[PDB]
Amino acid sequence: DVHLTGMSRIAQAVIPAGTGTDGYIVVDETIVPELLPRLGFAARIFQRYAVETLEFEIQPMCPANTGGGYVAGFLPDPTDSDHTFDAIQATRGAVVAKWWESRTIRPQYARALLWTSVGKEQRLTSPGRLILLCVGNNTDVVNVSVLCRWSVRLSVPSLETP
Amino acid sequence: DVHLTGMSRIAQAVIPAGTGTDGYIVVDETIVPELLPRLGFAARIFQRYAVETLEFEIQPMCPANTGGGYVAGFLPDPTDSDHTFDAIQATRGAVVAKWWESRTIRPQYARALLWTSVGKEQRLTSPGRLILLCVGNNTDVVNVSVLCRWSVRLSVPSLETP
Amino acid sequence: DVHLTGMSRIAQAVIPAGTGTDGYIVVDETIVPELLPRLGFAARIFQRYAVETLEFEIQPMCPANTGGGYVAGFLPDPTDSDHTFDAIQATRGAVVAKWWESRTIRPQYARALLWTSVGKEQRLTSPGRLILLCVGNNTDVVNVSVLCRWSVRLSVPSLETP
Amino acid sequence: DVHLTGMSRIAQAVIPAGTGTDGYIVVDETIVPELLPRLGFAARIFQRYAVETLEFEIQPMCPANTGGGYVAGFLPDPTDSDHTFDAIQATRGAVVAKWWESRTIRPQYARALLWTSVGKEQRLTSPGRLILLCVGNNTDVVNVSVLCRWSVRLSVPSLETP
Amino acid sequence: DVHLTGMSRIAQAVIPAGTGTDGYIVVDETIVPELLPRLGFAARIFQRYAVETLEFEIQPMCPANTGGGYVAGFLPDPTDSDHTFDAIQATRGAVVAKWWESRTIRPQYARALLWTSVGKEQRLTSPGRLILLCVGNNTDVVNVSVLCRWSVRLSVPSLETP
Numbered sequence: 084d085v086h087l088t089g090m091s092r093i094a095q096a097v098i099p100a101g102t103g104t105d106g107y108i109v110v111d112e113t114i115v116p117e118l119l120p121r122l123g124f125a126a127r128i129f130q131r132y133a134v135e136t137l138e139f140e141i142q143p144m145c146p147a148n149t150g151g152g153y154v155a156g157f158l159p160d161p162t163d164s165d166h167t168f169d170a171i172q173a174t175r176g177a178v179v180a181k182w183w184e185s186r187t188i189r190p191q192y193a194r195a196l197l198w199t200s201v202g203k204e205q206r207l208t209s210p211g212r213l214i215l216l217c218v219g220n221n222t223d224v225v226n227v228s229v230l231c232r233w234s235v236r237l238s239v240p241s242l243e244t245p
Numbered sequence: 246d247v248h249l250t251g252m253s254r255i256a257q258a259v260i261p262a263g264t265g266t267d268g269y270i271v272v273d274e275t276i277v278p279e280l281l282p283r284l285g286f287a288a289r290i291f292q293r294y295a296v297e298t299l300e301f302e303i304q305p306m307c308p309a310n311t312g313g314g315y316v317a318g319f320l321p322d323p324t325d326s327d328h329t330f331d332a333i334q335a336t337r338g339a340v341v342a343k344w345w346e347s348r349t350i351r352p353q354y355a356r357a358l359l360w361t362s363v364g365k366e367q368r369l370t371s372p373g374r375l376i377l378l379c380v381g382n383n384t385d386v387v388n389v390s391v392l393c394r395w396s397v398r399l400s401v402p403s404l405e406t407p
Numbered sequence: 408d409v410h411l412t413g414m415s416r417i418a419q420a421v422i423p424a425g426t427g428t429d430g431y432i433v434v435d436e437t438i439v440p441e442l443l444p445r446l447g448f449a450a451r452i453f454q455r456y457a458v459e460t461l462e463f464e465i466q467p468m469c470p471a472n473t474g475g476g477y478v479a480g481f482l483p484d485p486t487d488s489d490h491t492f493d494a495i496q497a498t499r500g501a502v503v504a505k506w507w508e509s510r511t512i513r514p515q516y517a518r519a520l521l522w523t524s525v526g527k528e529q530r531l532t533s534p535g536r537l538i539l540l541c542v543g544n545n546t547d548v549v550n551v552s553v554l555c556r557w558s559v560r561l562s563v564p565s566l567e568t569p
Numbered sequence: 570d571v572h573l574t575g576m577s578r579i580a581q582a583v584i585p586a587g588t589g590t591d592g593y594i595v596v597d598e599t600i601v602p603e604l605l606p607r608l609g610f611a612a613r614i615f616q617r618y619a620v621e622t623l624e625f626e627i628q629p630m631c632p633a634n635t636g637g638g639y640v641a642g643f644l645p646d647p648t649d650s651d652h653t654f655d656a657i658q659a660t661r662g663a664v665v666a667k668w669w670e671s672r673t674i675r676p677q678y679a680r681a682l683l684w685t686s687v688g689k690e691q692r693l694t695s696p697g698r699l700i701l702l703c704v705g706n707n708t709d710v711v712n713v714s715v716l717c718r719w720s721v722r723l724s725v726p727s728l729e730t731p
Numbered sequence: 732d733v734h735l736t737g738m739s740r741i742a743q744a745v746i747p748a749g750t751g752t753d754g755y756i757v758v759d760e761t762i763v764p765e766l767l768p769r770l771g772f773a774a775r776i777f778q779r780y781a782v783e784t785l786e787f788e789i790q791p792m793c794p795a796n797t798g799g800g801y802v803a804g805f806l807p808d809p810t811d812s813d814h815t816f817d818a819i820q821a822t823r824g825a826v827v828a829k830w831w832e833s834r835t836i837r838p839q840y841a842r843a844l845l846w847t848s849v850g851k852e853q854r855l856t857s858p859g860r861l862i863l864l865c866v867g868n869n870t871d872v873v874n875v876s877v878l879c880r881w882s883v884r885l886s887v888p889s890l891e892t893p
Contacts, residue, residue, distance in 0.1 A: 092820055121821050142827050144867050146798030147471075147633075150308030150345075152388065172254055173283050179304050179390065181345070183798075183829070219306050219388050226800065226867050228827065309633075309795075312470030312507075314550065334416055335445050341466050341552065343507070381468055381550050471795075474632030474669075476712065496578055497607050503628050503714065505669070543630050543712050636794030636831075638874065658740055659769050665790050665876065667831070705792050705874050 084238045085129070091119040093213060095228045100221055106168060109153065109215040109227060113161050115208065116199055117245075119233060126199040127245065129237035133196045134210055139188035140230040141215070147183050151219035153227070154179045157190035161209045171214050179218070182225045200243055246400045247291070253281040255375060257390045262383055268330060271315065271377040271389060275323050277370065278361055279407075281395060288361040289407065291399035295358045296372055301350035302392040303377070309345050313381035315389070316341045319352035323371045333376050341380070344387045362405055408562045409453070415443040417537060419552045424545055430492060433477065433539040433551060437485050439532065440523055441569075443557060450523040451569065453561035457520045458534055463512035464554040465539070471507050475543035477551070478503045481514035485533045495538050503542070506549045524567055570724045571615070577605040579699060581714045586707055592654060595639065595701040595713060599647050601694065602685055603731075605719060612685040613731065615723035619682045620696055625674035626716040627701070633669050637705035639713070640665045643676035647695045657700050665704070668711045686729055732886045733777070739767040741861060743876045748869055754816060757801065757863040757875060761809050763856065764847055765893075767881060774847040775893065777885035781844045782858055787836035788878040789863070795831050799867035801875070802827045805838035809857045819862050827866070830873045848891055 094110045103109070112118060114137075116126035126132065141155055156177040158165060171177060176190035193210045202208055213229065256272045265271070274280060276299075278288035288294065303317055318339040320327060333339060338352035355372045364370055375391065418434045427433070436442060438461075440450035450456065465479055480501040482489060495501060500514035517534045526532055537553065580596045589595070598604060600623075602612035612618065627641055642663040644651060657663060662676035679696045688694055699715065742758045751757070760766060762785075764774035774780065789803055804825040806813060819825060824838035841858045850856055861877065 089821065089823075090825060120817060144798060144800040144829050146870065147309045147795045150306060150385070150388075152306040152390075169282060173251065175251075177252060179392070181306050218390065222308065223798070226798075228800075228866065230827070309471045312468060312547070312550075314468040314552075331444060335413065337413075339414060341554070343468050380552065384470065471633045474630060474709070474712075476630040476714075493606060497575065499575075501576060503716070505630050542714065546632065633795045636792060636871070636874075638792035638876075655768060659737065661737075663738060665878070667792050704876065708794065 084236065086234070086236050087122065087125055088234045089121045091121060091231050091233070093118055093229050093231050098221060098225050100223060103151070103217050103221045105218050105220065107217050108166055109217060110229060111212065111214050113209045113212045119231065122233065122235065125237060127243050128240060130199055130239040130241045131196055132199055132235045132237045133194065134192050134233065134235050136234045137190065137192050138232040139190070139213065140185065140232070141178070141227065142185050142230060143182050143225060143227040145182045145225040146223055149182045149221055149223040149225055151217055151221045152179065152181050153215060153217055155186070155188055155215050157188060157211050157213060159191070159193050159211045161205045161212055165212070165214065168216065171216065182221070246398065248396070248398050249284065249287055250396045251283045253283060253393050253395070255280055255391050255393050260383060260387050262385060265313070265379050265383045267380050267382065269379050270328055271379060272391060273374065273376050275371045275374045281393065284395065284397065287399060289405050290402060292361055292401040292403045293358055294361055294397045294399045295356065296354050296395065296397050298396045299352065299354050300394040301352070301375065302347065302394070303340070303389065304347050304392060305344050305387060305389040307344045307387040308385055311344045311383055311385040311387055313379055313383045314341065314343050315377060315379055317348070317350055317377050319350060319373050319375060321353070321355050321373045323367045323374055327374070327376065330378065333378065344383070408560065410558070410560050411446065411449055412558045413445045415445060415555050415557070417442055417553050417555050422545060422549050424547060427475070427541050427545045429542050429544065431541050432490055433541060434553060435536065435538050437533045437536045443555065446557065446559065449561060451567050452564060454523055454563040454565045455520055456523055456559045456561045457518065458516050458557065458559050460558045461514065461516050462556040463514070463537065464509065464556070465502070465551065466509050466554060467506050467549060467551040469506045469549040470547055473506045473545055473547040473549055475541055475545045476503065476505050477539060477541055479510070479512055479539050481512060481535050481537060483515070483517050483535045485529045485536055489536070489538065492540065495540065506545070570722065572720070572722050573608065573611055574720045575607045577607060577717050577719070579604055579715050579717050584707060584711050586709060589637070589703050589707045591704050591706065593703050594652055595703060596715060597698065597700050599695045599698045605717065608719065608721065611723060613729050614726060616685055616725040616727045617682055618685055618721045618723045619680065620678050620719065620721050622720045623676065623678050624718040625676070625699065626671065626718070627664070627713065628671050628716060629668050629711060629713040631668045631711040632709055635668045635707055635709040635711055637703055637707045638665065638667050639701060639703055641672070641674055641701050643674060643697050643699060645677070645679050645697045647691045647698055651698070651700065654702065657702065668707070732884065734882070734884050735770065735773055736882045737769045739769060739879050739881070741766055741877050741879050746869060746873050748871060751799070751865050751869045753866050753868065755865050756814055757865060758877060759860065759862050761857045761860045767879065770881065770883065773885060775891050776888060778847055778887040778889045779844055780847055780883045780885045781842065782840050782881065782883050784882045785838065785840050786880040787838070787861065788833065788880070789826070789875065790833050790878060791830050791873060791875040793830045793873040794871055797830045797869055797871040797873055799865055799869045800827065800829050801863060801865055803834070803836055803863050805836060805859050805861060807839070807841050807859045809853045809860055813860070813862065816864065819864065830869070
């Protein structure tokens with residue numbers, strides 16, 4: 084029974100000018116233990132993890148003459164069909180800013196007890212998704228690089244071979 | 246007897262260059278339960294709602310070379326003729342900023358007990374309006390997207406069919 | 408015996424490019440009860456007012472490529488000849504910033520007991536002035552819009568006809 | 570035995586483009602009672618002053634497309650030969666920023682008991698210097714205007730005639 | 732047995748346009764007592780130093796039209812082969828920002844008891860490294876100037892001749 088903390092990049096995308104209109108989904112990746120690089124080498128030990136805190140950052144990178152914008156949130160449904168504006172805006176801990184403006188997400192997690200390995204049902208292995216989509220129309224080349232700030236309490240030891 | 250919280254976009258407008266001079270009303274929409282998308286599916290249950298807290302944001306989106314400005318407020322008169330600068334400026338919880346500057350409204354609500362359905366008198370169904378108007382003369386394409394942050398205590402159950 | 412609060416614009420000026428060099432007085436208006444629009448309809452009732460708190464804002468509006476600057480203060484002498492830099496800088500609660508930078512004045516008032524109507528002596532009807540002057544040389548069109556934040560305790564009822 | 574407070578500009582310089590490379594000393598003036606305009610008319614009364622607090626600001630004024638930078642500090646040696654980068658950086662309460670970025674110096678004074686009039690030894694009449702030098706290479710016309718925030722306890726009355 | 736504090740520049744680099752793509756290591760210097768200029772004249776006295784606090788700043792200097800970015804961290808391995816993105820991101824106290832954005836590192840030191848002089852093993856003379864690398868593609872000439880904020884408790888007197 085341990086307690087791990089850290090900070091990890093989830094994903095990164097670059098968007099040229101003109102491409103990246105409103106509703107263009109910038110990035111969409113679930114919170115599976117494979118993506119976090121310190122926890123990916125620590126979910127290969129234990130079997131069950133239960134998240135205590137989980138916060139995000141967005142940290143986009145563009146000059147101050149682009150002037151579009153984005154929206155970011157957290158959906159605790161690890162489903163496979165959510166491409167819209169309205170569900171991201173209405174969740175708890177959602178932000179909206181410009182492409183040179185950095186915000187901070189403090190979402191509403193599940194506090195259940197999950198499983199580390201992959202399986203047939205996705206609702207017991209990944210406590211949420213992160214969806215990011217543009218809302219204006221970009222002018223220059225932007226560069227988003229989303230982060231994560233996790234803290235978890237792995238238990239019941241094993242050793243997987245993924 | 247419940248208590249709901251959330252955060253919801255009210256409205257959104259885009260303004261080209263040249264159009265949008267001083268006193269051009271950018272957006273003007275009352276706080277009716279239809280506009281908030283999580284509360285619109287929850288005012289269809291109950292009958293009476295009484296707001297506890299209600300705060301706003303403006304979050305406009307433009308590059309830093311536009312240089313106009315705006316003013317935002319909250320009028321607890323849900324009337325149908327208010328197109329001026331002076332009444333918005335003089336209320337409680339009014340802001341003024343540039344089009345690339347985001348502020349936060351903490352207004353003075355009514356704390357009465359209202360009704361959810363539409364009716365002949367508007368003073369018992371919507372506790373205020375939101376008026377937003379430009380004060381300078383824009384240079385580039387701006388993009389405002391006002392928000393809301395409501396909290397309410399719906400009671401006496403029913404089921405409407407609007 | 409009452410207590411009023413609020414927030415009110417005092418004045419507004421626009422300055423083209425080239426005009427508005429150093430020492431050009433941007434705006435200079437005393438704090439008479441006529442200028443505040445909610446208190447102007449409330450000094451017409453009572454006779455004596457004594458200010459409790461009084462704070463200011465500047466809120467200028469220009470793009471981030473102008474690069475001049477300003478200085479703002481508060482002089483509790485309601486005289487009629489003060490056009491200089493040194494007296495504004497040396498008062499209590501003075502600020503200095505750029506034309507796209509907004510500051511906040513917390514001045515040193517008089518806490519005496521004044522009169523509302525106009526009279527032969529100016530030292531009993533207006534507890535200060537607001538002087539604003541440029542210090543650099545502007546590049547683009549700026550737009551200043553000074554504010555006020557007053558709180559006062561009107562007493563001894565009457566009714567004037569100004 | 571008194572206690573005076575206030576705020577005063579020390580100096581001001583303007584730097585054209587190209588001139589003002591790295592190590593170009595922008596301004597260098599000691600803290601003599603002559604330079605502060607409210608204390609200059611109050612050091613002409615008393616004889617001995619002992620500083621209680623002393624803080625600075627820099628407040629430079631340029632558009633956001635210049636992109637050089639500066640460094641600022643406080644040296645409690647009122648000597649007459651200090652033209653370098655390393656001694657300013659290594660003191661207590663030193664700052665570094667861009668030419669459109671404003672910082673705040675909270676230095677380490679002497680808390681001795683000095684003399685107001687000029688004399689043969691400089692170490693008993695001025696408790697420090699202020700040196701400001703560029704570190705990049707400017708692009709546009711900048712305009713620095715350093716400030717001061719003094720508080721002192723003049724005593725033993727006299728009257729000088731400087 | 733003493734306690735020293737201060738603030739010192741570690742290093743400085745300038746990057747032209749085009750050069751300085753992603754993964755280009757901007758600066759990489761260990762925390763040896765030679766680099767800090769006040770502690771370099773104080774490690775020549777004592778023999779053993781044990782750090783109490785150690786924090787960093789980045790303070791980069793460019794106009795707001797460059798729009799690349801960086802990442803900064805602290806590795807308590809004073810090894811000689813670490814040129815990657817992933818190890819810097821995953822440490823404790825790592826930051827990411829734009830080239831006109833300044834952040835602050837609060838790292839995780841070793842709190843052991845080291846030696847001041849150079850030796851055959853590097854793990855007893857320098858409690859960490861500082862690696863800084865670009866993540867976007869620069870547009871204009873940037874100018875980074877990293878800082879340090881150390882506090883240490885030198886003991887057991889000697890005198891080296893390096």
